[PDB]
C-alpha cells in the first residue's frame with residue numbers, strides 16, 4: 001500500500017534539503033519525520049507531493065472551490081495531507097482528520113520595543129497594524145468568533161491599508177521585521193516559537209489564547225484513518241512526539 005502525501009513547503013515541517021536527491025529523500029522537517037515514523041508504525045509506503053499552489057486550504061465562496069492540501073484530498077489526488085494543518089469546521093466538513101498530533105494556541109508576533117502588551121491593547125489602537133495568513137486557520141479564529149474583542153480585531157484587520165493579510169508565515173515574519181514595529185503578526189504559537197527563537201529582534205506579545213490542533217487530513221471515511229490515529233497515539237504515549245517536537249522547535 002502506497003499513499004500520496006500532499007504537503008506544502010514551510011519550515012520546520014517540510015522543506016527542500018540542501019544538496020551538496022531523489023523522491024522522499026529530497027525533503028526534511030517535522031512532518032517528514034512523522035510520516036516516516038508512521039510509515040514504520042502503520043506499515044505503508046508513501047510519496048511526498050508538495051501541492052502546486054503551496055497553500056494550506058481554504059474555501060473561496062466567490063468560486064465555490066477549495067485550494068491547497070485540502071483540495072488535493074477532495075479530488076483524491078492524495079490520500080494523506082500533512083503540515084501545520086489546523087483542524088477547522090469548514091475543513092472538517094469536506095475532509096476527515098486523524099486524532100491531533102499537536103496542540104497549540106494563537107499569539108502575537110511583534111518587533112521588540114512595542115508598548116502593546118495584550119490583544120485587547122492591540123485592537124484598541126491603530127498606530128500598529130496587524131494581520132494573519134490569508135484564508136488561514138488563525139483568520140478563522142477571528143472571523144468566526146462572537147467575542148466582541150475578536151470581532152473588533154477582525155473588523156480592524158479588514159479595514160487596514162495596505163492589505164493586512166499575508167500568503168504565509170514567512171511573509172508575515174518578514175513583514176514584522178521590515179516594519180520596525182508598525183506591524184504585528186497574529187499566528188500560531190508553534191510557528192511563533194520557531195521564528196522568535198531564530199530572530200532576536202522579535203518577541204511575543206501577551207499570553208497564548210485559543211485551543212487549536214494539528215491533524216493529518218484524509219479523505220472522508222477513509223479506511224486508513226483509524227490506522228493512522230492509533231499510530232499517532234502510540235508515538236505520543238511512547239514520548240516520541242515530545243522528542244520530535246523538541247528536535248525541530250528547540251532553541252536568543
Ligand SMILES: N[C@@H](CCC(=O)O)C(=O)O
Pocket residue numbers: 056057084085086087132133135136137138139186187188
Ligand atoms: N495552521 C494554519 C496556518 C497558520 C495560521 O493561520 O496562523 C492553517 O492550517 O490554516
